[PDB]
A paper describes a structure:
Nitrogenase provides access to bioessential nitrogen via the reduction of highly inert atmospheric dinitrogen (N2) to ammonia (NH3). In all nitrogenase isozymes, H-subunits form a homodimeric reductase component (‘HH’) that transiently associates with and transfers electrons to a catalytic core. This catalytic component is a heterotetramer composed of two D- and two K-subunits (‘DDKK’ or α2β2) and contains the active site metallocluster where N2 is bound and reduced to NH3. Three previously characterized ancestral variants were targeted from phylogenetic nodes within the evolutionary lineage of Azotobacter vinelandii Nif (wild-type, ‘WT’): Anc1A, Anc1B, and Anc2.
Anc1A and Anc1B are the same age, whereas Anc2 is reconstructed from an older phylogenetic node. As an additional distinction, Anc1A and Anc2 contain an ancestral D-subunit protein complexed with WT H- and K-subunit proteins. Specifically, all ancestors crystallized at pH 6.5, which is unusually acidic for nitrogenase. In addition, all ancestral proteins crystallized in space group P 212121, which differs from the space groups for the same proteins in A. vinelandii NifDK (i.e., WT; space group P 21), Clostridium pasteurianum Nif (space group P 21), and Klebsiella pneumoniae NifDK (space group C 2). All three ancestors showed anisotropic diffraction: 2.65–2.93 Å for Anc1A, 1.82–2.8 Å for Anc1B, and 1.82–2.42 Å for Anc2. Notably, a non-conserved Nif-D α-helix (positions 165–174 in Anc1B) lies within interacting distance of HH. This helix contains several substitutions across all ancestors, albeit the positioning of polar amino acids differs among Anc1A, Anc1B, and Anc2. Herein, the D-subunit S165A substitution is consistently present across all ancestors and may influence interactions with HH S175 in the ATP-bound complex, potentially reducing stability.
Residue numbers in the entry:
A (entry chain B), C (entry chain D): 2 to 523
B (entry chain A), D (entry chain C): 4 to 481
Write the structure that this text describes.
């Protein structure tokens, strides 16, 4: 039942006695549920070193992964180009999911089409789907560019995208001069970040490969910036802001920050902002190209080095103090622009914050996960703060990356208790935070379930989650944050120290038991 | 308010955008309701392939199998079999609620996957699958059984998951259900429902045929309620207040045991016709268990449904139905008095999957609201047949609506509220149009039953009358 | 005792058995402590309507105030002027506390001097203190201006500041043309905000009263902005940013944002930025003066209207959507500058966030406190969000203010359950959140103790604190936030929604009991 | 690294900044240690008025009475009597820890005030004060008694708080202690200590003089430990492990009953000489209770202190002291082995109130660190006498240092670490110099006792060796 002046939703409605009784009868009468004691005993066993051993011996099962599939990344990349429709050649179920996943993270519309290949196309291939699809998409949604990627069906069947698009043009489904860059994005290779790399290199090739004759390195006096798979609006914005403050001419190649943040002013805008085709066409005339997330931009890098002849600087993701410094110094060198007083002051304000907060941060132990570049930047900054990153998980990481991270750890005393895991999942991570308990986890919304598991063992074992990464689905508007630059470091620092203090307040809020340390001033 | 002729002119205008082939097709999927129409002639085409490139809202057969029918079964482990995408996007995105200790005796919010790599494409994944089942037995020993939810590649590479399953089931002493719900099959979620219902028929349902069970004359199963926000629980309670005994729930908060005992019940109560008519009809064929359709959205339909269900039993149950209805009337009257005056006369457009586009109309009407447009992603003609009587005259109808169509229709009809999914929500908010998710209940609900209706009314009022809607235009642009 | 590789601080050290036993003997042997049962019974009684009755009948005792004293505000005002040293004529104990209070909030140095009046001066007065003090301060710390306020001692004995400063000049302690504006700031009138008003009007008079002959309204084509007592760096910054974006010529009169945020770069900077003397001297030539916090700038307003002849617009604090809109439209009208695209889009993004988050915010009940302008802006925004501000407390509020807030409440349906309290303290508020429990409190760090009290009654009665206001001492770097403009509204919205969701996750984290509603996606 | 001559030259250079009068005064408050001095000549002038306008770190007599001595007494209510400022700024700023149910039987972190308005200035606050006591009895019935902590105005307006207190105490049957700690009195926190010690003497201490008490040979009181971060508890435990019975703690975690029983003890153990020598001396005069100074900072001083305290009793306590010291040796040696190699050879400057500028030197030396500068806000000559033996030769000394002086000394001496208060912390951090709060323990501690020393060493290392200090210079400015 309900009181109408105080209506209860699922929580706490189902805690009402009548519901409790009914569900106790359901369980006992009809579910043949294991007895509680046995559930308790098995739970206990899932928290042990013995269970962890069995867990890490898995060779075939993946549980609770911490990656997605390539075309997810291809779509995000495509969204960053002016009046560009993402188009995924293959099965439509995929596009429904890609859109939902991003809708839930950004709380925004996400525009993407499928060509809806079915069983009919499973033997003969999707040539007709491509012809009708391109024509329908162009007329219905009026993009200036359609960026084509693939689902696993199309990859398995082996559709030749190049031929299908060229035939679509030859037979008048779309104009010859209408831009349709493409990439194979197999979901059973790499991950979402690989998809972004592949899509990006596809678009770069489309507008530059056949027109290299007139290009001269440095002639436009700009720096290209490739951001990679990035799901924080603040990150796109902070890079632009810093370069503009330095007076550095730049082109951000794939810039979705406008279309992922349109105003609610009475009108729906399918398209907004984005990198122009002119920018991509002119990009070989830049002084150089900077890759903000190099560990998932390897194909892009080979193209930019091999065809554009740019000497891509060896830069880490500009996260934390050192790596932001090095990014700015390199941009200074390439551009000839000095680092201005505003950025100098901003840096020192970050360092002020570090001095002010160091006592609470020192020695704190973190589990963390995410994409390779993000993870290593977070690792680096944690070391700069005097924190210990004990469990470092990158499901979609490789051996070369792990070695680079292991060397970062080995150069700091705060790295001594750290291990890097690649190819491991969040069920692996769950065991680690039981057997070798840290203070906190840093990761995405999927971590909430690990936090729940730890609390069930007992309050003293609970490992709180700090949400930084992708996706974040159970909080609102964190997609507006920043994790790059001094600005991102300040926000990360603040989140960390206040998580520590918040948890300390919780633990010291017990009247007459723990509140002796419930200090007003920290 | 628009005339049939104007609505029909709207349809014609919107179709102008498409190439001829697309136009000719889409013209068959858009209609205006006319209940003084033909007995046998369809009003609309349905359950056909989506056109390429037009931005359908539809998903795939894996969604309808793994996401919809199987995923909710709380004490089995469902393997997403293929590359890593499908399981990750579908991980805990549907609020099919359950009671359990997750990771120990229940597994619903977890993602189990075979995470196919290129090696698995080239050499096949049968060996991988066999090892996975072993590893599952080691690490999750309280699982009652396993389902294998095929993603696109399994069919295309010629893996034999039926063979893997039958050998593994013999060894481990539990059902291992192979499901051929690869996403290239069918046109939508719909065929996944069908494939999934058949996998249940063929691998689970008959296991206890020989066995005795302690039965009563009042034993029922709730078929096709996935317990979104506790929807099934707020339904179940009314059925028990009425004197019935709910032996099984398919598949919201559901278990293997419950499914396996369902052949012993006296009556199958079908809420979601679309998704589970298949198994309902199988059960009437093989076991002689009748099934009836009901509707638990809003007081009108609940009363109708309770009386109808009760009349299948005896005078006692019928007396009971009258008691239950009377008990909740003061609540319903209080809810209507509070919220109906705030919603009276407001117009709604809906777009959902296979049921709710017709099923929720009664509840809106209990609040004085009118549905001026509705449609389905993947309904069949039998669903459109059932929609006609539920709809007002000259109501706009749309099957597998395109992104473009839905936007144009909304701009013209100017509804006060839209009820659709997550892919639609943030579009219409930008237009200044109140929007409520009618799949996820916008993280609210339940909406089924008497307790559900009070939450439904609060939510419609909360959103439709919210202050935020008065603030979209900057004062210096008026 | 201690494990050296895992050293325990007070928490959890004193939870060790040996310490627990020792303290149990201390209590039983030596403290003559009331029995637990009796403590329980009295605690219970403090949570009741009966106790609340007695509590609100207080006429003489104040418990846990929510205000400070005038000179604290005078100091902050003074800090906002270039190379200005705050100088408090009177007792030195005061300045020790003022400095500490700001040090703890801002985690920065806070420079202020006393003239250290002692018993010697208690009969004869502090004339010699002023002479030597001015001279010593000027030589030691080399300010360009010394801004004088008073402690309660000097007010009680009745020192004539004007005469003392004039005598300091006549007798050669400081140069005649050295700027020494002053104000009487009695701690037993009004509050800290009153002190800011008094100091500001003092400085305005110092630089303008005798030189009005040559002034012409509008001649410099600027708008003056007086911010009032403000302890969020973001607030000063966002006002500047918005005006600059509009291309509006302005003077921020009292701008401490630089000196409250110097970089840690190896050098201590006692002074930084601030409003110039030139800006104050020229301020009568502005088009007009806008007061951001009019409910504590009444004296300033009388001066600006009576002597400058400025037609100060009737504007509320620019908090929330409507009042930010009104501020921008007024500045547009006065300046002739159109409101630009960038601010228009920023507004629409705020509105987007409101549409995205409204379902979680709807009907949430809040207790809140702070200074009058801050409180009413928070009330206004809560109404814009569909929240109910049930307990509205302003210790330093007056009857005219209460009436203005009551009218704001009456213009919204969400105001129906609200009461405004003036002259009440946080012990009053404690009773209200027990007898008429809200969902959350919004206030300063002093609220933490109310949250502890509510949890002791039981988890179901706990009212979580959301820290917005001053002071905030138990979290780090929240002083960098914004509460004004669209930017401030976005940050407040984000904080509110995520407090709600955080608390919902806590309530639904119980395995197999409440985690049915522990949803990934919210 | 600096000669006496250089230090003396530093002093002369720093004094150049001042006008003549100020310079003449300040020259008396700055010195260089030389233990080859006539131990009857003063090394430094102390406990004099601050110069106007020079930015002393010092507080007022209210701070030393309310903030320091009285405030920690957990089961009494301390009224800040006057306008609202003093109580607010002093609300929970000092970590004088206690165990209780705050608002019910303890009141330490609350701010009770008479919040004087203008009418109270003009007409006097005595009537207000009387009503306040009534209101307190109504609303806080478990309070064991009340103190009245006078702020500047009480004395200046001629209120008679002694009369109010006498009448109110008779009525309510509990001590009501009037304290004339107005902040214009004295020069610093110091006189507030003295006023507060006398208020205890005159209004609390003798109440149980007639009465019987169950005494033992080993009854002691800890005098002058305010339990900063649990300092007194980590002291108490050692004294009880040694076989003594701590009847009272003054005033960290202290109660009225404990104070009132203190005249029954066999020995007063004085940690903070400055703040509570007065009451210690009174208790020796009136009751014949001896008092001894001790020091629980660091293993060297703890051992010395335990053996010294034990030798006042009997052979058994002395045996016990040897047992306690031996029990903790493994711990101390582990702490030294871990942290002393990271701190060896590092230089420290201190500036604190009345005790810790000398008392913590031994602990720094147990980690191989050297104090190259120290000073006090408000010490007296007797404190400086006690500092000489604790100090290294040619150590810089500063009494009531000015903002300017402390900055200049730090710039020249270039210490590796500074230990001072909140008003100093953020200055030196900007200069790139590690800083640890030596009042608040930077929200850490305890630092007293064996358990305290482990935390002290961790903290010094944490801060001195922190990575943040290598990062202050932008790499493009090197
Ligand atoms: S199963 Fe169907 S799309 Fe009947 S696939 Fe879909 S939880 Fe919809 S209109 Mo999401 S035929 Fe259920 C449905 Fe309806 S997932 Fe839920 S809301 S009543
Ligand atoms: S009482 Fe004194 S200033 Fe002896 S007023 Fe001060 S808690 Fe200091 S050096 Mo704050 S004579 Fe205690 C002191 Fe020492 S408040 Fe604490 S640290 S040992
Ligand atoms: Mg949005
Ligand atoms: Mg700082």
């Amino acid at each position: 039942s309900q009181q109408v002046d105080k209506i209860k939703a699922s929580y706490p409605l189902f805690l009402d006695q009548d519901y409790k009784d009914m569900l106790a009868k359901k369980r006992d009468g009809f579910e043949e549920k294991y007895p509680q004691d046995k559930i308790d005993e098995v739970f206990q066993w899932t928290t042990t070193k013995e269970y962890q051993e069995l867990n890490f011996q898995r060779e075939a099962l993946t549980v609770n992964p911490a990656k997605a599939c390539q075309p997810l990344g291809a779509v995000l990349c495509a969204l960053g180009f002016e009046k560009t429709m993402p188009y995924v050649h293959g099965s439509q179920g995929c596009v429904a999911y890609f859109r939902s996943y991003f809708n839930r993270h950004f709380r925004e519309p996400v525009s993407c089409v499928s060509d809806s290949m079915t069983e009919d196309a499973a033997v003969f291939g999707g040539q007709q789907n491509m012809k009708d699809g391109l024509q329908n998409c162009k007329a219905t949604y009026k993009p200036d560019m359609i960026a084509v990627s693939t689902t696993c069906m199309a990859e398995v069947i082996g559709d030749d995208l190049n031929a299908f698009i060229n035939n679509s043009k030859k037979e008048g489904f779309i104009p010859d001069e209408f831009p349709v860059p493409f990439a194979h994005t197999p979901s059973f290779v790499g991950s979402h970040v690989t998809g972004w790399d592949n899509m990006f290199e596809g678009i770069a090739r489309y507008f530059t490969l056949k027109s290299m004759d007139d290009k001269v390195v440095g002639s436009n006096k700009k720096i290209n910036i490739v951001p990679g798979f990035e799901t924080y609006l603040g990150n796109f914005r902070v890079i632009k802001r810093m370069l503009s403050e330095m007076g550095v001419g730049y082109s951000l190649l794939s810039d979705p920050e406008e279309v992922l943040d349109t105003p609610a002013d009475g009108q729906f805008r399918m398209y907004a902002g984005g990198t122009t085709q002119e920018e991509m066409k002119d990009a070989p005339n830049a002084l150089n190209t900077v890759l903000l997330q190099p560990w998932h931009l390897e194909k892009t890098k080979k193209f930019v080095e091999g065809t554009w002849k740019h000497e891509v600087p060896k830069l880490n993701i500009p996260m934390g103090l050192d790596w932001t410094d090095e990014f700015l110094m390199k941009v200074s060198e390439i551009s000839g622009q000095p680092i201005p007083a505003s950025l100098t002051k901003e840096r020192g304000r970050l360092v002020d914050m570090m001095t002010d907060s160091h006592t609470w941060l020192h020695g704190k132990r973190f589990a963390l996960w995410g994409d390779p570049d993000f993870v290593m930047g977070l690792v680096k900054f944690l070391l700069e703060l005097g924190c210990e990153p004990v469990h470092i998980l990158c499901h979609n990481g490789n051996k070369r990356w792990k070695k680079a991270v292991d060397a970062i750890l080995a150069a700091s005393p705060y790295g001594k208790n750290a291990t890097v895991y690649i190819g491991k999942d969040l069920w692996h991570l769950r065991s680690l935070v039981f057997t070798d308990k840290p203070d906190f986890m840093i990761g995405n919304s999927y971590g909430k379930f690990i936090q729940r598991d730890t609390l069930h063992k007992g309050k003293e074992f609970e490992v709180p989650l700090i949400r930084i990464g992708f996706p974040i689905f159970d909080r609102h508007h964190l997609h507006r944050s920043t994790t790059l630059g001094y600005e991102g470091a300040m926000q990360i620092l603040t989140t960390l120290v206040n998580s520590i203090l918040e948890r300390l307040d919780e633990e010291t809020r017990g009247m007459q038991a723990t509140d002796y340390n419930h200090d007003l001033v920290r | 308010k628009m005339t049939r002729e104007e609505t029909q002119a709207l349809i014609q205008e919107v179709l102008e955008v498409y190439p001829e082939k697309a136009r000719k097709d889409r013209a068959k999927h858009l209609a205006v309701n006319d209940p003084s129409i033909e007995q046998s002639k369809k009003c609309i085409t349905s359950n056909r392939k989506s056109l390429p490139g037009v931005m359908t809202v539809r998903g795939c057969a894996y969604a309808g199998s793994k996401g919809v029918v199987w995923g909710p079964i709380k004490d089995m482990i469902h393997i997403s079999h293929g590359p890593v995408g499908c399981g990750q996007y579908s991980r805990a995105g549907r609020r099919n609620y359950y009671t359990g200790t997750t990771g120990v005796n229940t597994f619903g919010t977890m993602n189990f996957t075979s995470d196919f790599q290129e090696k698995d494409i080239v050499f096949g994944g049968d060996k991988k699958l066999a090892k996975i089942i072993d590893e599952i037995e080691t690490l999750f020993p309280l699982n009652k059984g396993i389902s294998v939810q095929s993603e696109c590649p399994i069919g295309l590479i010629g893996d034999d998951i039926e063979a893997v399953a039958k050998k593994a089931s013999k060894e481990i002493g539990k059902p291992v259900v192979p499901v051929r719900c690869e996403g290239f099959r069918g046109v939508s979620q719909s065929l996944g429902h069908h494939i999934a219902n058949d996998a249940i028929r063929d691998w689970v349902l008959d296991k206890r045929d020989g066995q005795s069970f302690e039965s009563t004359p009042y034993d029922v199963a709730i078929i096709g309620d996935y317990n979104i926000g506790g929807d099934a629980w707020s339904s179940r309670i009314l059925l028990e207040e009425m004197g019935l005994r709910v032996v099984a729930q398919w598949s919201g908060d559901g278990t293997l045991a419950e499914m396996e005992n369902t052949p012993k019940v006296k009556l199958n109560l079908l809420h979601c016709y679309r998704s589970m008519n298949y198994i309902s009809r199988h059960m009437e064929e093989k076991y002689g268990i009748p099934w009836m359709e009901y509707n638990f959205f809003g007081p009108t339909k609940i009363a109708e449904s309770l009386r109808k269900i009760a009349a299948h039993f005896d005078d006692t149950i019928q007396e009971n139905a009258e008691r239950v209805i009377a008990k909740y009337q003061p609540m319903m009257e209080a809810v209507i008095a509070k919220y109906r005056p705030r919603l009276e006369g407001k117009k709604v457009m809906l777009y959902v999957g296979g049921l709710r586009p017709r099923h929720v109309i009664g509840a809106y009407e209990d609040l004085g609201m009118e549905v001026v447009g509705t449609g389905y992603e993947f309904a069949h003609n039998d669903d459109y047949d059932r929609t006609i009587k539920e709809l007002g005259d000259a109501t706009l109808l749309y099957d597998d609506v395109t992104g473009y169509e839905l936007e144009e229709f909304v701009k013209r009809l100017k509804p006060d509220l839209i009820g659709s999914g997550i892919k639609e929500k943030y579009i219409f908010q930008k237009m200044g149009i109140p929007f409520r998710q009618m799949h996820s209940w916008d993280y609210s609900g339940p909406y089924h039953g008497y307790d559900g209706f009070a939450i439904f009314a609060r939510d419609m009022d909360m959103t439709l009358n919210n202050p935020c809607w008065n603030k979209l235009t900057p004062p210096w642009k008026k």
